[PDB]
Unconditional design. Structure first.
Length: 259
């Protein structure tokens, strides 16, 4: 077992309240009270449509991804990454795609800075669509499962998708979710991908401890095995220690207007 597989097995043993306590222990967390109020009421202001905006902000503020030019957002959901990207000065267009049916999050219409540069398309399976060329590739797809096998499969689908888009579309910036980075097969594929496409792996401190998600990004360089293991060891130490409440930080608030 890798440390990550070992972590997953332990996670699966937690009861309901153990799991809840664990999942937010020692993490960073944005205060979503205002955002949720605004969304429930359809109020047009600068709040982020999802928790995801803050994750992309954390990576973008550190230069791990520097959205520019034509941005594609695969698995956009409500659109938290798309709206965040659209607000950035180097960004020309955002093409955003998501399933958007049967319970899956539909894009939410907002008027934050650059909204007019986004084209949202629902009813799209990004794994079964033609590559379109662009400059920035974002993909935030990866649904957790109790089963390592299922998470591994879901992750390989995303990595196979990203590989094809990166090869055919001439992208230069990327930020790709790796749901399950810790199995041998995935680590193997990540090493191969890095050899051809560069980049590194980052753990966003806003991610909950109940997911081992990391992001493959163009604006750093890391190894695979040690970098992933370090995260496994942190998540394991947090599960063995008593839980502590998360550290709150201000959520993403964007300016308004067209670009
Ligand atoms: C983690 S959410 C993205 C959160 C988003 N980055 C945000 O900030 O709001 C991933 C989204 O991918 C969508 N999705 C999953 N599989 C997909 C697929 N095969 N094609 C298109 N969208 C998919 C899901 O419905 C979900 O809404």
């Amino acid at each position: 077992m890798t440390p990550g597989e070992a972590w997953k097995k332990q996670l699966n043993k937690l009861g309901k309240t153990q799991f809840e306590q664990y999942k937010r222990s020692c993490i960073l967390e944005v205060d979503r009270t205002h955002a949720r109020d605004s969304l429930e009421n359809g109020i047009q202001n600068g709040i982020a449509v999802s928790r995801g905006s803050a994750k992309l902000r954390w990576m973008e503020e550190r230069g791990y991804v520097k959205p520019t030019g034509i941005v594609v957002d695969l698995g956009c959901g409500r659109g938290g990454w798309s709206y965040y990207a659209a607000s950035l000065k180097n960004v020309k267009k955002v093409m955003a795609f998501t399933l958007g049916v049967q319970g899956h999050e539909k894009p939410i219409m907002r008027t934050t800075l650059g909204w007019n540069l986004i084209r949202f398309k629902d009813k799209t399976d990004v794994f079964n669509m033609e590559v379109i060329p662009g400059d920035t590739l974002l993909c935030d797809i990866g649904e957790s499962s109790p089963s390592i096998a299922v998470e591994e499969q879901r992750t390989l689908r995303v990595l196979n998708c990203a590989k094809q888009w990166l090869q055919e579309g001439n992208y230069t910036e990327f930020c790709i979710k790796v749901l399950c980075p810790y199995t041998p097969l995935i680590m193997e594929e990540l090493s191969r991908l890095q050899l051809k496409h560069g980049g590194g792996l980052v753990r966003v401190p806003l991610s909950r401890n109940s997911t081992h998600e990391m992001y493959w990004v163009s604006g750093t360089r890391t190894d695979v095995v040690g970098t992933v293991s370090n995260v496994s060891r942190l998540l394991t130490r947090r599960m063995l220690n008593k839980p502590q409440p998360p550290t709150l930080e201000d959520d993403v608030i964007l300016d308004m207007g067209t670009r």
